[PDB]
Short mmCIF file of C-alpha atoms in Angstrom, two decimals:
data_model
loop_
_atom_site.label_atom_id
_atom_site.label_comp_id
_atom_site.label_asym_id
_atom_site.label_seq_id
_atom_site.Cartn_x
_atom_site.Cartn_y
_atom_site.Cartn_z
CA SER A 8 130.22 102.73 113.47
CA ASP A 9 126.91 104.59 111.89
CA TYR A 10 127.22 103.14 108.64
CA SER A 11 124.61 100.12 108.00
CA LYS A 12 125.16 97.72 105.23
CA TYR A 13 120.77 97.21 105.40
CA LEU A 14 120.78 101.34 104.33
CA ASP A 15 123.23 100.89 101.51
CA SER A 16 121.34 101.49 97.93
CA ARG A 17 123.52 98.60 96.05
CA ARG A 18 122.06 96.50 98.42
CA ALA A 19 118.68 97.49 97.74
CA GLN A 20 119.53 97.12 94.26
CA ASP A 21 120.80 93.34 95.02
CA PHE A 22 117.39 92.56 97.09
CA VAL A 23 115.08 93.47 94.06
CA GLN A 24 117.42 91.63 92.09
CA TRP A 25 117.03 89.03 94.12
CA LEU A 26 112.94 89.52 94.73
CA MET A 27 112.81 89.87 91.07
CA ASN A 28 114.29 86.96 90.07
CA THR A 29 112.49 84.52 92.54
CA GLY B 3 106.50 94.72 79.97
CA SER B 4 105.39 95.75 83.14
CA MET B 5 107.31 93.52 85.10
CA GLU B 6 110.53 95.37 83.91
CA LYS B 7 109.13 98.40 84.24
CA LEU B 8 108.53 97.89 88.20
CA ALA B 9 111.90 97.14 88.25
CA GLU B 10 113.11 99.88 86.18
CA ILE B 11 110.94 102.31 88.66
CA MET B 12 112.84 100.81 91.52
CA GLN B 13 115.77 101.25 90.07
CA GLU B 14 115.21 104.85 89.61
CA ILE B 15 113.82 105.09 93.54
CA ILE B 16 116.93 103.46 94.86
CA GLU B 17 118.96 105.82 92.68
CA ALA B 18 116.82 108.56 93.86
CA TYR B 19 117.20 107.25 97.64
CA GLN B 20 121.10 107.58 97.18
CA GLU B 21 120.35 111.25 96.37
CA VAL B 22 118.64 111.69 99.00
CA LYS B 23 121.72 109.77 101.38
CA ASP B 24 124.74 111.85 99.06
CA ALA B 25 123.29 115.24 100.24
CA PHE B 26 122.47 114.13 103.82
CA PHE B 27 125.78 112.85 104.44
CA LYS B 28 127.30 116.02 102.98
CA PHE B 29 124.82 118.19 104.87
CA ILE B 30 125.92 116.61 107.72
CA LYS B 31 129.62 116.94 107.16
CA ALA B 32 129.18 120.43 106.45
CA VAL B 33 126.83 121.16 109.39
CA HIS B 34 129.64 119.62 112.14
CA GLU B 35 132.50 121.72 110.29
CA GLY B 36 130.36 124.93 110.67
CA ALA B 37 129.64 125.27 106.36
CA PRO B 38 128.29 128.50 105.89
CA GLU B 39 124.41 127.87 105.68
CA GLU B 40 124.53 128.38 101.76
CA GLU B 41 126.06 124.87 101.24
CA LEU B 42 124.00 123.36 104.32
CA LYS B 43 121.36 124.55 102.42
CA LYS B 44 122.45 123.24 98.43
CA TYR B 45 122.26 119.99 100.66
CA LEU B 46 118.82 120.49 101.63
CA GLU B 47 117.56 121.51 98.46
CA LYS B 48 119.38 118.37 96.58
CA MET B 49 117.32 116.44 99.36
CA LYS B 50 114.13 118.10 98.69
CA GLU B 51 113.98 117.48 94.69
CA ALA B 52 115.64 114.11 94.93
CA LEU B 53 112.23 113.35 97.71
CA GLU B 54 110.29 115.07 95.33
CA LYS B 55 111.32 112.47 92.54
CA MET B 56 111.08 109.76 95.06
CA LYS B 57 107.05 110.44 95.72
CA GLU B 58 106.37 110.85 92.03
CA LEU B 59 108.16 107.48 91.42
CA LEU B 60 106.62 105.75 94.04
CA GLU B 61 102.86 107.06 92.59
CA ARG B 62 104.27 105.28 89.11
CA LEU B 63 105.45 102.48 91.21
CA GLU B 64 102.08 102.07 93.02
CA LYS B 65 99.90 102.47 89.86
CA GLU B 66 102.01 100.04 87.54
CA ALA B 67 101.84 97.44 90.89
CA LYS B 68 98.17 97.59 91.21
CA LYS B 69 97.98 96.72 86.91
CA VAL B 70 99.75 94.14 87.39
CA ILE B 71 98.19 92.53 90.17
CA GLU B 72 94.11 92.65 89.52
CA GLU B 73 95.79 91.40 85.93
CA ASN B 74 97.60 88.66 86.71
CA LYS B 75 95.57 87.60 90.41
CA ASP B 76 98.73 85.50 91.14
CA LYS B 77 99.40 85.28 94.94
CA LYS B 78 102.75 85.31 94.56
CA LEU B 79 103.50 87.75 91.95
CA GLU B 80 101.13 89.59 93.92
CA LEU B 81 103.51 88.78 97.00
CA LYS B 82 106.64 89.72 95.27
CA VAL B 83 105.23 92.90 93.93
CA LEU B 84 104.11 94.32 97.92
CA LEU B 85 107.54 93.31 98.82
CA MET B 86 109.01 95.65 95.85
CA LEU B 87 106.66 98.02 96.97
CA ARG B 88 107.80 97.61 101.01
CA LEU B 89 110.80 98.28 100.08
CA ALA B 90 110.77 101.43 98.06
CA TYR B 91 107.82 102.90 100.76
CA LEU B 92 110.99 102.00 103.65
CA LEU B 93 113.40 103.86 101.20
CA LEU B 94 111.10 106.63 100.66
CA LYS B 95 110.68 106.97 104.77
CA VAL B 96 113.97 106.67 105.59
CA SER B 97 115.08 109.69 102.70
CA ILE B 98 111.70 111.65 104.21
CA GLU B 99 113.47 111.03 108.03
CA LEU B 100 116.75 111.82 106.41
CA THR B 101 115.80 115.35 105.17
CA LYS B 102 113.81 116.15 108.17
CA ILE B 103 116.93 115.60 110.41
CA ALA B 104 118.34 118.27 108.36
CA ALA B 105 115.43 120.29 107.77
CA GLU B 106 115.80 120.46 111.50
CA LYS B 107 119.53 121.83 112.11
CA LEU B 108 119.02 124.14 109.32
CA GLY B 109 115.61 125.57 111.10
CA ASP B 110 113.64 125.12 108.27
CA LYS B 111 110.26 124.91 110.26
CA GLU B 112 107.95 124.63 107.19
CA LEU B 113 109.54 122.14 105.34
CA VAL B 114 109.83 119.75 108.83
CA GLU B 115 106.17 120.36 109.14
CA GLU B 116 105.27 118.78 105.34
CA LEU B 117 108.00 116.27 106.29
CA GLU B 118 106.47 115.58 109.04
CA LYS B 119 102.49 114.82 106.95
CA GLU B 120 105.07 112.98 104.71
CA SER B 121 106.23 110.24 107.42
CA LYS B 122 103.12 109.69 108.74
CA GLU B 123 101.80 109.34 105.48
CA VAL B 124 104.25 106.82 104.64
CA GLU B 125 103.91 105.20 107.92
CA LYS B 126 99.96 104.43 107.36
CA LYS B 127 100.97 102.96 103.74
CA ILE B 128 103.80 100.46 104.88
CA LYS B 129 101.05 99.39 107.36
CA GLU B 130 98.58 98.99 104.95
CA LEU B 131 101.07 97.03 102.81
CA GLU B 132 102.53 94.94 105.69
CA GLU B 133 98.63 94.05 106.77
CA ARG B 134 98.04 92.40 102.78
CA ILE B 135 101.94 90.32 103.10
CA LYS B 136 101.43 88.92 105.69
CA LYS B 137 97.92 87.62 104.48
CA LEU B 138 99.76 86.53 101.62
CA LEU B 139 102.47 84.86 103.38
CA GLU B 140 99.85 82.30 104.50
CA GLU B 141 98.83 82.46 100.71
CA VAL B 142 101.92 81.11 98.93
CA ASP B 143 104.85 78.25 99.30
CA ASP B 144 107.34 80.31 98.62
CA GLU B 145 110.06 80.10 100.96
CA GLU B 146 112.27 82.28 99.34
CA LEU B 147 109.33 85.00 99.37
CA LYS B 148 109.02 84.34 102.76
CA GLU B 149 113.08 85.33 103.44
CA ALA B 150 112.79 88.12 100.87
CA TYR B 151 109.77 89.31 103.64
CA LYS B 152 112.32 88.85 106.91
CA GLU B 153 114.72 90.80 104.78
CA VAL B 154 113.22 93.58 104.81
CA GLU B 155 111.79 93.33 107.87
CA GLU B 156 115.26 93.40 109.19
CA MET B 157 115.68 96.16 106.84
CA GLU B 158 113.21 98.53 108.86
CA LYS B 159 114.30 97.66 112.06
CA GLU B 160 118.36 98.20 111.42
CA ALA B 161 116.93 101.53 109.06
CA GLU B 162 114.91 102.72 112.30
CA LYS B 163 118.22 102.07 114.61
CA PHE B 164 120.41 104.24 111.64
CA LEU B 165 117.98 107.02 112.20
CA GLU B 166 117.74 107.17 115.94
CA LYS B 167 121.67 107.57 115.36
CA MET B 168 121.24 110.57 113.11
CA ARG B 169 119.12 112.85 114.95
#
């Protein structure tokens, strides 16, 4: 109910990895 | 090289963010049970030590981002690197506000004061970055990066919504 996928640290890792590989 | 170094620092920032989160959620669980204050204070100390770590890593990220920019004077690389910085400061902002919530429950008034300063400083740095990033959006023609900007924007909105639900 409180959990946000956007606060997930793995998501942040995947977002960095995506952003870095653009 | 420094692009690897940026990613490596980012990994260390995300890892310290995770330590803040882990400590905060254990703190909240403990405070709702009525856990003894030494355990609550342990988790607050763990958040503070990880925050200190993140603050230093962001200084390294920042001084490394600057060298990569200006050496490259490339718009797409600058936009990439500012969006990484934009993400790292969001994670720092969340980490500050979570520690502030714990410090407030434990009544640690001096830590709350210091975290107030840190959150306004990160807000100010986030707004500076938004200004530079918005300028580069005009200048780059990579919609992948435009989607990446939209994503971190939606991250901060959700993070703010999450922070309001905690306090």
